[PDB]
Design a protein around this nucleic acid. Structure first.
Ligand SMILES: [Mg+2]
Ligand SMILES: [Zn+2]
Ligand SMILES: [Zn+2]
Lengths: 49, 97, 84, 263, 133, 113, 66, 47, 49, 436, 147, 140
RNA sequence: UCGUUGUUUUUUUCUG
C-alpha cells in the first residue's frame, strides 16, 4: 500500500514504473480510486529485515 | 501565419495583415478588443472545435444557448460558484449550488 | 387586466404535448373518481383510454390558462385547440 | 414405409440405422427419449441421523442421482394423482439405508449397493438400484470414520426427465445424416480446402461418396439417420426405444381426442 | 402474353465472391446492341460461357397470396428450366436509342439494354422472367 | 425465489384446456391453435407432416417464449378441406407410422437377439 | 469433494468408476489408458475422472465431534 | 384458531406427501412452508 | 434530503436480455410485482375486477 | 403491479434524459429485470452484472405523464444530435447482415414459419423469388416483410452504379428491398438510417413495432442458421506472415537509418520542435504507418467467410485495428503520448543495454496476440493498459463535475409562450430558441 | 479466467441444447461478439488446449513465455481425430437439423462469483423511516429506499 | 538476491538461451528482439524464469501473455471472488460468511506456477463444456 | 383485541 492519500488526483504514483520489474505484479491492482496505490508482491519477492 | 502568445490590438494593426479576419483563441481578448458579440461568436467557435474534434456532432442550438447564457450580461460569466452565485437569482437557487 | 380578449389571442393555436399530458391526466383522474362522461363508451374500462377517446372527439370541458412571462395570461378552451 | 436396421446392439446401448422417415420424426424421437420416458428415482430423503462430514443436502442430492431399475414403472401410478392419502405402496417405493463404521481406525465406504428395498408394489420388478455386475458395489455415496453413523429412509417416485434431470434414462443420443453433406446443409469452414482439413464421419463408408462430375440435386431430402442410444442401466435400450415411441403415440392420441372432443 | 423474347449468347459468367450466384453477360443474336446482365443461381441452374438462353419476359403466367403450385393447373412456365419473379425499379427512358430497364428479383438484379422498339412494352411493375435450356 | 415449479411444465392445470382453437378472420379457412404444456417435440413433428399434404396451404407455429411451455400453430388449408380434418388426418397418419416403426424395430431386435 | 455421480454434460454414470480408475493408476498405466479401459470415450465424461480433486479424505483427517 | 405452529402434511395436490409447518391460518387457506426447498405455498384447510 | 432523498415504491435488481419483448416492455420478477403496489380507485368500470 | 402498467426505469448514473424512460410492465418469473436488447444503447448498459432501478407511479395523473412524455417510443430520436438513439445491435445486426447477402435462399417451410413470427404480418405470403424448379425466397423479401409499406430510402456508396455489383448502397421502394446489403450503415442508429425514416413517417408506435419485427425475424433465421467464431479466424496463410515480416523489418531498418542520421545531426528539424522531439515524432509516425500496412495486408488476406471479417463488416463489434492487433502486430505502445521512458539509467529495462533507441527497446510489440508476447513486450503492454485504466478512473469524475456545474447553470431556462427564452427572473437570453 | 464476466441469460434443457454428432450438448454457451473487441485470444487457446488434454488424457501446460505454439496444438488435435482448429459440426436441437456454419466447441475453466442475484434483489413499498428526517432508511438489509 | 537499486547496473539475460548466440522462420510463435545494437554482450545474470514477474492471482491465468492487459487485470481482481474450498477445516470454524463448491475440479489447462499455490489441490471452478455460438439471441 | 416498534457513528474492502 501507499499512504499517498486521494486529495489531488495526479498520476505519477499510480502508473507502473520500470523499476517495478519483477518486484511487484504488473497485472494485479484494484479498480477505482485505489487503482495503482495498492500493489501486490511479485511471486519471488523478498523483504530485507 | 499562426503564432503563439497573444497581443491582438497590436498585431491587428500591423501593415500588410488583414485586420478584418485576425482571430485569437483567447476569447477574453476578444471581449476586451472586438466588443461582446465577437466574443460570443468566437466562444461558439471554440466550443464547436473542441466537441467536433473527436468526430462527434452536437446540434447547433445547444451550443448557441450555452454561449448566449454565458454572455447574456455583457461580460464573461464563467461557469463556477463565483460567477453564477454573483448573479441576482433567488437566494434559494444559489444556495443549493 | 391580466386576461386577454378572445380577438387578439396570439399564442400558437395548436396543443403542446405538455398540455396534452396535463389534460389527459386531469380528465382521467376526474372520470376515475365518479365524474360524468361526456361521450359514449363501448367496451373500454380504463379511465385514461376514456380520456384519450374523449379528447379525440374534442369534447373536454377544460380551459387552459396560459401565463405569459410578464404575468398577463390568456385562456383557451380545449374545444378550440387544434390537436395533432 | 419406415425401415430400421440395427447395427450393433447391447443391453445398455444401441447403434442403429433409421431411414425413410421425416427428419422431424427422428429428431422428435430423440427429444422424447431424452425427456419424456418416465422412470423411477429417489424423491424424498429423511435423515433419521447423520454424523458424516457431508451436508445433509449433499447426501440427499447424491442419492437423487443414483439409477434405479425402473423396468415396470409403466405400471406405477403417478403419486400426484394417486387417490391414497399419503403414499400407498402402489404410487411409491420405499428404500432404506443405514451403514455405520465401527472401530477407531479404517474408513467405511457407503456404496449404492447398501440401499435395500423395504416396500413397493410387488412383485413389480422396480426399485432395486442398478448394478453393472454381480460383485459391482456400485456408486460411492460417502466415507465414514470412527464413531460416524448414517441413517436415512429414502423414497422414490415415477417422474419424467422434464421435471428434473434425475429421471433421464438416456445418457447421450448420437445423431447424424448425410455424412458426405450431399444435401449441402452445411458449408465447411476451411483455410485451404474442405476435404483435407475436415475429418470424415465414422459412417463415411456406409454411403457412396459424391462423384466428381455429379451435379447438385435439389429435390433430394435427408433419408438416413445414424443414431446411437445409451442408457444409465435403469432401462434396457430397446425398452427405452419402445417406450418413447409409445409415449409419443399416446400423446398424439390425447391431442386427437381433444380435437374431436372440442365439439 | 409474352411481352418479349429473344435468344442470347452468354459472353461471360462471373462468380464473384458469391458461390451459388453468378452474374452473366448476355447479348442477343437475332439483333445486336441488346445486352442482358443477369444474376442467376449457379447450382439451381448452372450455365457456361457462350451458351444459348431462350429469354422470355411476361407480366403473367395464366393462360393474391401465393400457394404451392398444384400439378393440376397449367401455366406458361411449364416450358422453361429457370423461372424468377421480378420487380421493376427503374425504367430509364434514356438517350435516343439507349433504353435501360432495371429489374430486381428480390435481391437478384437484371439490366436490359437495346432499342426502344423491343423494350417499349416493358413499362410494367412486376415482370416474370423465363429461361429455357 | 421467483423460480417456476418444474412440475408446472407438463401437468396442465384444470381451468385451461389442453388445446384451444380460434379462427383467423384475415383469410378464409384459416385457424389458430393455442396449445399448452408442449414444445418443439410435438409442434415440429406435426408441422413436418402437415406440410407434406397437398391440400394444406399454410402451416406454421412458434414457441412464443421459452419460459412459458406452450406454442401456437397457424394452419390454413384450401377450401376443399377444413383445417381440423387435416390436423386429425396428420395425427392418425403419424400414429400409424409410429406403430409400423415399432413393429419393424421389434422384429429387428428379436432376430438380432 | 467426492467423485460426482453423473457427468453433468451428458449424464453417463461415472461415480462408481473412481475406485477402478485409481486401481489402474497404481499399477503404472497412464491416465489415457486407464480412461480407455473404463470405456470413457466422450471427453465430456473424461474431463471428470481426469480432473477431479478428492477432498473428503482430507476432511476425515479431523477427529469427529462425536 | 389455536392450531397454528404445528407440523402438517399434505395429502392431495402437486406437493402430496411433503412435511411442513403452518405459518398463517387466516381462514380456509393455510400457508405452510415446505421443508425441502426454501419456499412457502398456500393450500386450503381440506388438504 | 432536499434535492435528493430516498423514496418509496422502488426496486433494484439485475438485468438480462430477452429478444422476445416488445420495445417498450419490461420484465418484472413476480415477487417485486407482489411487493410493490399502485393505488387504484373504485368505480363501476372496475368494481367487479 | 399488473400487466401493461407504466413504470419508470432508470440506470445510475443518469447522464442524459434518455438514461431513464417509462416502460410497460409484463410480469415474468425468476428474479431479474428483462429488457429488449436494443434499448440498452441509451442506457449504456450491459448484462455483465449491471443494475437498474424501477420507480412506480402512485396516482392517475402521474401515469398520464409517464405514458405520454416518457414512453420509450417517443425517445427514439435524440435532440442532442437529431439522430436515432437506439438501433439494431449485436446478434441481430450481424445476423441481418448475412441474411441479406445476395446468395441466401430460404426453402418454403422455413419461410412459412418466419412470416408467422412477425406479429404485424398482413397474412399474405409473397411470391417466391424463384418459381422453378424449386420455390425459393431471398432473405431481402423477408426483411421487406418487416419494413412497413410505403417507405422510400436510398443511398450511394463509393460511387456505385445502379447495378450494385458489389451490393453496396441501399434502395427501398414502398417498403421493399430492391438491392444492397443491410448492415450498420442502414439499420444502425446513425442518422438518415431506416429507423429515422420510419419514425419521421409513420410515428413512434410503428417504429417500435419495426424494432420488434426485425429482431424476431433475424433472431429466428440466425437460430436456424447458426454462427460462431473460432481460433482459426485469427490465423492467416504463410505468405501473409511473410509479407508482414518483410514490412516490419523494412520499418525497423527505416527507423535504424533515422537514428543513424539524427545521431550524426543529419536529420532535419521540424518547425517548433527540437532534435529529440522531431526525431521521436518521426519514429512514431514510421511505426504507426508500419503497423497500419501490416494490418491492411492481413485484412486483404482474410477470406469473405472468416468469422471476424463477417462480424466487423457487419459493424456489430470490433473494427480494423482489432484485427490488426490480433493477427498482424500489436504495434507501438503509447504512454502519456510518448514512447516508453527510461525509468532505469538511460534504459527502459535492465535486459537492454545503455543508450539504445531501437523500437523493441522502447516498447514496440512486434508479435501479434495469436503468437504471444515476449516478457519485455508483455510488461510494456501492461504499462499501457494500467495507464488507460488510470485515465478512465480520473476522467469520469471530472466529467461528472463538469456535468453538474453545467446543469446547475442552465436548469431554469424555459421556452416561454412568446417564443423567447428566459431564465427564472424573466431575463431574456434568446429572442427565439435557436433562432428558428 | 480471462475477465469474460457474464450473467446467466436463460437456461435450456438437455434436449433443446444443440448437440454435436456424438451427443455432447454444451454445458454453457457464450456470445461470439464478446471476443474480438476484447481480443481475449487466450480464451480460445485455452479451450483448444483443454480439448486436447481431455482427449489425450492429461492436463496441458499453459506457462506463459514458452514454446507451445498454436500449430502444435492443432497438429495434436487433428492426429487425435478432430478438426484441426477445434470446430465441430453441430445440430440444432429444435429440429435436429445441421447448422449452416460450424461451432467452436470445447471445455473451459469457469468459476462462479459471489454476486448471486438473490443477494441484490430488493423492493420497498413502505417501511422504516429515519427518525431525524422522517425519510426511508438506507440499506437493503433494512428495507432501504432507492435514492 | 538483488534489490531494486542494484538492478540499475546489471545486464540480465531473459533466458539461458540468450547466453548462447544463435545462428526456423515460424508463423505461430514469437520472434525475439533484434538486439543487434550491441555487437558484444557481457551478461551478468539470467532471469530464473520470466513467468515469475506475475503476482499470486496473475499466476492463475493461463497463457497470460496472449491477452490484452486490462483483461488480465480484471481477471486478477476477479479471481479473488471465485467460490471454492477456502480451507479444509471449514466444518469446525464459525465464520460469518463462508461458501463452498460441491465438486471443485482442478483446471485442465494448468500453469507451472499453481504447483506452489496448491490451486490444483484447492481449486475454485469447474471445467464446463462451452460452445461459442449465437444460439437464440438470449445470450447477447 | 385491533394495535405493534429496532441506533448512530466512522472506517474498510467491494459492485456498475
Ligand atoms: Mg456494466
Ligand atoms: Zn398411492
Ligand atoms: Zn459425459
Amino acid at each position: 500500500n501507499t499512504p499517498i492519500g486521494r486529495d489531488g488526483k495526479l498520476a505519477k504514483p499510480r502508473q507502473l514504473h520500470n523499476t517495478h520489474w519483477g518486484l511487484v505484479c504488473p497485472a494485479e491492482t484494484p479498480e477505482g480510486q485505489a487503482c495503482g496505490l495498492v500493489k501486490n508482491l511479485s511471486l519471488l519477492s523478498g523483504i530485507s529485515i | 501565419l499562426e503564432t503563439d502568445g497573444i497581443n491582438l490590438a497590436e498585431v491587428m494593426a500591423v501593415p500588410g495583415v488583414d485586420s478584418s479576419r485576425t482571430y485569437s483563441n483567447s476569447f477574453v481578448e476578444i471581449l476586451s478588443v472586438l466588443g461582446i458579440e465577437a466574443t460570443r461568436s468566437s466562444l461558439y467557435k471554440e466550443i464547436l472545435n473542441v466537441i467536433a474534434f473527436d468526430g462527434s456532432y452536437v446540434n447547433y442550438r445547444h451550443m448557441a444557448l450555452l454561449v448566449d447564457v454565458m454572455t447574456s450580461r455583457g461580460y464573461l460569466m464563467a461557469i463556477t460558484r463565483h460567477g453564477i452565485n454573483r448573479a441576482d437569482t433567488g437566494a434559494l437557487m444559489r444556495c443549493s449550488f | 387586466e391580466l386576461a386577454i380578449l378572445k380577438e387578439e389571442r396570439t399564442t400558437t393555436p395548436y396543443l403542446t404535448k405538455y398540455e396534452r399530458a396535463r389534460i389527459l391526466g386531469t380528465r382521467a383522474l376526474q372520470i376515475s373518481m365518479n365524474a360524468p362522461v361526456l361521450v359514449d363508451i363501448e367496451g373500454e374500462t380504463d379511465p385514461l383510454q376514456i380520456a384519450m377517446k374523449e379528447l379525440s372527439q374534442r369534447k373536454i370541458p377544460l380551459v387552459i390558462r396560459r401565463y405569459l412571462p410578464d404575468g398577463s395570461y390568456e385562456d383557451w378552451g380545449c374545444d378550440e385547440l387544434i390537436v395533432d | 414405409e419406415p425401415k430400421v436396421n440395427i447395427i450393433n446392439a447391447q443391453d445398455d446401448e444401441v447403434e442403429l440405422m433409421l431411414s425413410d422417415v421425416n427428419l422431424s420424426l427422428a429428431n422428435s424421437l430423440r427429444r422424447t427419449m431424452l425427456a419424456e420416458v418416465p422412470t423411477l428415482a429417489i424423491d424424498l430423503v429423511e435423515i433419521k441421523m447423520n454424523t458424516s462430514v457431508l451436508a445433509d443436502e449433499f447426501i440427499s442430492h447424491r442419492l437423487g442421482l443414483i439409477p434405479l431399475v425402473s423396468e415396470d414403472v409403466e405400471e406405477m401410478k403417478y403419486s400426484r394423482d394417486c387417490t391414497c392419502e399419503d403414499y400407498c405402496d402402489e404410487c411409491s417405493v420405499v428404500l432404506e439405508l443405514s451403514a455405520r463404521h465401527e472401530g477407531e481406525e479404517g474408513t467405511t465406504d457407503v456404496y449404492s449397493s447398501s440401499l435395500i428395498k423395504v416396500s413397493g408394489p410387488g412383485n413389480l420388478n422396480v426399485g432395486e438400484p442398478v448394478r453393472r455386475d454381480d460383485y459391482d458395489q456400485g456408486i460411492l455415496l460417502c466415507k465414514l470414520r470412527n464413531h460416524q453413523e448414517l441413517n436415512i429412509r429414502c423414497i422414490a417416485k415415477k417422474g419424467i426427465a422434464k421435471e428434473h434431470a434425475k429421471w433421464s434414462p438416456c445418457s447421450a443420443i448420437a445423431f447424424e445424416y448425410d455424412p458426405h453433406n450431399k444435401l449441402k446443409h452445411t458449408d465447411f469452414w476451411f483455410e485451404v480446402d474442405a476435404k483435407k482439413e475436415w475429418p470424415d464421419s465414422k459412417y463415411a463408408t456406409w454411403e457412396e461418396p459424391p462423384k466428381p462430375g455429379e451435379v447438385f440435386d435439389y429435390k433430394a431430402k435427408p433419408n438416413r439417420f445414424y443414431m446411437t442410444v445409451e442408457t444409465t442401466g435403469s432401462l434396457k435400450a430397446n425398452q427405452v426405444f419402445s417406450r418413447g415411441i409409445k409415449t409419443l403415440q399416446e400423446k398424439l392420441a390425447n391431442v386427437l381426442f381433444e380435437l374431436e372432443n372440442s365439439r | 402474353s409474352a411481352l418479349f423474347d429473344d435468344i442470347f449468347t452468354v459472353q461471360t459468367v462471373d462468380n464473384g465472391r458469391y458461390n451459388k450466384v453468378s452474374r452473366i453477360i448476355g447479348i442477343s443474336t437475332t439483333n445486336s446492341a441488346i445486352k442482358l446482365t443477369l444474376d442467376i443461381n449457379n447450382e439451381m441452374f448452372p450455365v457456361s460461357q457462350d451458351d444459348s438462353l431462350t429469354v422470355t419476359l411476361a407480366n403473367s403466367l395464366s393462360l393474391k397470396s401465393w400457394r404451392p403450385p398444384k400439378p393440376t393447373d397449367k401455366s406458361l412456365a411449364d416450358d422453361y428450366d429457370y423461372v424468377m419473379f421480378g420487380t421493376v425499379y427503374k425504367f430509364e427512358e434514356g438517350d435516343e436509342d439507349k433504353i435501360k430497364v432495371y429489374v430486381s428479383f428480390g435481391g437478384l438484379l437484371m439490366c436490359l439494354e437495346g432499342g426502344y422498339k423491343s423494350l417499349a412494352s416493358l413499362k410494367q411493375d412486376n415482370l416474370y422472367i423465363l429461361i429455357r435450356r | 425465489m421467483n423460480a417456476p415449479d418444474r412440475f408446472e411444465l407438463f401437468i396442465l392445470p384444470d381451468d385451461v384446456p389442453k388445446l384451444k382453437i380460434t379462427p383467423d378472420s384475415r383469410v378464409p379457412n384459416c385457424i389458430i391453435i393455442k396449445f399448452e404444456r408442449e414444445d418443439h417435440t410435438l409442434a415440429n413433428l406435426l408441422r413436418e407432416e402437415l406440410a407434406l399434404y397437398p391440400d394444406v396451404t399454410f402451416v406454421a407455429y412458434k414457441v412464443e417464449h421459452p419460459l412459458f411451455a406452450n406454442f401456437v400453430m397457424r394452419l390454413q388449408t384450401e377450401e376443399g378441406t377444413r383445417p381440423k380434418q387435416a390436423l386429425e388426418r396428420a395425427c392418425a397418419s403419424i400414429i400409424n407410422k409410429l406403430k409400423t416403426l415399432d413393429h419393424k424395430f421389434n422384429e429387428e431386435w428379436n432376430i438380432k437377439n | 469433494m467426492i467423485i460426482p455421480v453423473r457427468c453433468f454434460s451428458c449424464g453417463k454414470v461415472v461415480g462408481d468408476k473412481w475406485d477402478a480408475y485409481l486401481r489402474l493408476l497404481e499399477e503404472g498405466k497412464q491416465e489415457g489408458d486407464a480412461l480407455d479401459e473404463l470405456k470413457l470415450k466422450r471427453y465430456c465424461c473424461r474431463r471428470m475422472v481426469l480432473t477431479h480433486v478428492d477432498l473428503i479424505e482430507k476432511f476425515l483427517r479431523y477427529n469427529p465431534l462425536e | 384458531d389455536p392450531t397454528l405452529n404445528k407440523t402438517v402434511k399434505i395429502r392431495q395436490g402437486g406437493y402430496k406427501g411433503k412435511i411442513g409447518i403452518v405459518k398463517e391460518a387466516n381462514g380456509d387457506r393455510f400457508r405452510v412452508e415446505l421443508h425441502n426447498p426454501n419456499k412457502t405455498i398456500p393450500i386450503p384447510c381440506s388438504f | 434530503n432536499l434535492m435528493g432523498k430516498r423514496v418509496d415504491f422502488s426496486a433494484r435488481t439485475v438485468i438480462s436480455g430477452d429478444p422476445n419483448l416488445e420495445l417498450d416492455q419490461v420484465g418484472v420478477p413476480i415477487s417485486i410485482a407482489k411487493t410493490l403496489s399502485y393505488p387504484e380507485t373504485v368505480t363501476q368500470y372496475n368494481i367487479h375486477r | 403491479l399488473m400487466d401493461d402498467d407504466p413504470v419508470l426505469f432508470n440506470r445510475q448514473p443518469s447522464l442524459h434524459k434518455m438514461s431513464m424512460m417509462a416502460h410497460r410492465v409484463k410480469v415474468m418469473p425468476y428474479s431479474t429485470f428483462r429488457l429488449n436488447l436494443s434499448v440498452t444503447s441509451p442506457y449504456n448498459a450491459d448484462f455483465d452484472g449491471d443494475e437498474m432501478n424501477l420507480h412506480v407511479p402512485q396516482s392517475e395523473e402521474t401515469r398520464a405523464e409517464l405514458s405520454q412524455l416518457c414512453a420509450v417510443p417517443l425517445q427514439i430520436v435524440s435532440p442532442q444530435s437529431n439522430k436515432p438513439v437506439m438501433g439494431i445491435v449485436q446478434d441481430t445486426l450481424c445476423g441481418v447482415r448475412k441474411m441479406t447477402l445476395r446468395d441466401t435462399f430460404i426453402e418454403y417451410e422455413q419461410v412459412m414459419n418466419m412470416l408467422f413470427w412477425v406479429p404485424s404480418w398482413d397474412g399474405v405470403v409473397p411470391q417466391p423469388a424463384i418459381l422453378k424448379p424449386k420455390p425459393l425466397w431471398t432473405g431481402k423479401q423477408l426483411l421487406s416483410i418487416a419494413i412497413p409499406s410505403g417507405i422510400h430510402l436510398q443511398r450511394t456508396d463509393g460511387g456505385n452504379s445502379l447495378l450494385s455489383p458489389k451490393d453496396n448502397g441501399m434502395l427501398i421502394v414502398d417498403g421493399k428491398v430492391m438491392f444492397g446489403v443491410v448492415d450498420k450503415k442502414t439499420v444502425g442508429s446513425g442518422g438518415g438510417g431506416l429507423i429515422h425514416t420510419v419514425m419521421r413517417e409513420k410515428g413512434p408506435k410503428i417504429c417500435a413495432e419495426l424494432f420488434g419485427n426485425i429482431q424476431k425475424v433475424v433472431n429466428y433465421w440466425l437460430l436456424h442458421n447458426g454462427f460462431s467464431i473460432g481460433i482459426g479466424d485469427a490465423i492467416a496463410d504463410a505468405s501473409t506472415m511473410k509479407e508482414i515480416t518483410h514490412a516490419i523489418s523494412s520499418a525497423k531498418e527505416q527507423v535504424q537509418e533515422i537514428i543513424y542520421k539524427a545521431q550524426h545531426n543529419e536529420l532535419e528539424l521540424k518547425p517548433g520542435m527540437t532534435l529529440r522531439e522531431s526525431f521521436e515524432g518521426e519514429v512514431s509516425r514510421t511505426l504507426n504507418d508500419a503497423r497500419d500496412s501490416a494490418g491492411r495486408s492481413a485484412e486483404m488476406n482474410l477470406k469473405d467467410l472468416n468469422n471476424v471479417k463477417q462480424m466487423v463488416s457487419a459493424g456489430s463489434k470490433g473494427s480494423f485495428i482489432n484485427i490488426a492487433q490480433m493477427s498482424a502486430c500489436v504495434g507501438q505502445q503509447m504512454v502519456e503520448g510518448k514512447r516508453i521512458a527510461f525509468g532505469f539509467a538511460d534504459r527502459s529495462l535492465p535486459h537492454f543495454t545503455k543508450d539504445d533507441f531501437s523500437p523493441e527497446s522502447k516498447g514496440f510489440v512486434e508479435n501479434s496476440y495469436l503468437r504471444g508476447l515476449t516478457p519485455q513486450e508483455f510488461f510494456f503492454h501492461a504499462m499501457a493498459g494500467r495507464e488507460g485504466l488510470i485515465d478512465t478512473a480520473v476522467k469520469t469524475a471530472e466529467t461528472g463535475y463538469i456535468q453538474r456545474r453545467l446543469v446547475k447553470a442552465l436548469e431554469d431556462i424555459m421556452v416561454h409562450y412568446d417564443g423567447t427564452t428566459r431564465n427564472s427572473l424573466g431575463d431574456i437570453i434568446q429572442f427565439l430558441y435557436g433562432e428558428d | 479466467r480471462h475477465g469474460q464476466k457474464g450473467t446467466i441469460g436463460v437456461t435450456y434443457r438437455h434436449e433443446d441444447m444443440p448437440f454435436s454428432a456424438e451427443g455432447i450438448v454444451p454445458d454453457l454457451i457464450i456470445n461470439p461478439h464478446a471476443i474480438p473487441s476484447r481480443m481475449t485470444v487466450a480464451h480460445l487457446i485455452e479451450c483448444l488446449l483443454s480439448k486436447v488434454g481431455s482427449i489425450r488424457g492429461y492436463e496441458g501446460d499453459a506457462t506463459p513465455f514458452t514454446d507451445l505454439t498454436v500449430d502444435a496444438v492443432s497438429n495434436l488435435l487433428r492426429d487425435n481425430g478432430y478438426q484441426s482448429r477445434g470446430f465441430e459440426v453441430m445440430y440444432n436441437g429444435h429440429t435436429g437439423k445441421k447448422l449452416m456454419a460450424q461451432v467452436f466447441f470445447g471445455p473451459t475453466y469457469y468459476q462462479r462469483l459471489r454476486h448471486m442475484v438473490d443477494d441484490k434483489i430488493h423492493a420497498r413499498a413502505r417501511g422504516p423511516v429515519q427518525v431525524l428526517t422522517r425519510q426511508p432508511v438506507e440499506g437493503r438489509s433494512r428495507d432501504g429506499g432507492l435514492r | 538476491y538483488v534489490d531494486g537499486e542494484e538492478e540499475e547496473t546489471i545486464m540480465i539475460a531473459m533466458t539461458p538461451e540468450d547466453l548462447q548466440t544463435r545462428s526456423l522462420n515460424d508463423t505461430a510463435k514469437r520472434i525475439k528482439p533484434e538486439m543487434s545494437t550491441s555487437s558484444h554482450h557481457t551478461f551478468t545474470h539470467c532471469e530464473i524464469h520470466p513467468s515469475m514477474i506475475l503476482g499470486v492471482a496473475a499466476s492463475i491465468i493461463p497463457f497470460p501473455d496472449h491477452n490484452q492487459s486490462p483483461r488480465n487485470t480484471y481477471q486478477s481482481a476477479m479471481g479473488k471472488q471465485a467460490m471454492g474450498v477456502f480451507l479444509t477445516n471449514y466444518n469446525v470454524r464459525m465464520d460469518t460468511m463462508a461458501n463452498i463448491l460441491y465438486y471443485p475440479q482442478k483446471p485442465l489447462a494448468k500453469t507451472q506456477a499453481m504447483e506452489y499455490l496448491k490451486f490444483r489441490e484447492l481449486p475454485a471452478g469447474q471445467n464446463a463444456i462451452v460452445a461459442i455460438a449465437c444460439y437464440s439471441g438470449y445470450n447477447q
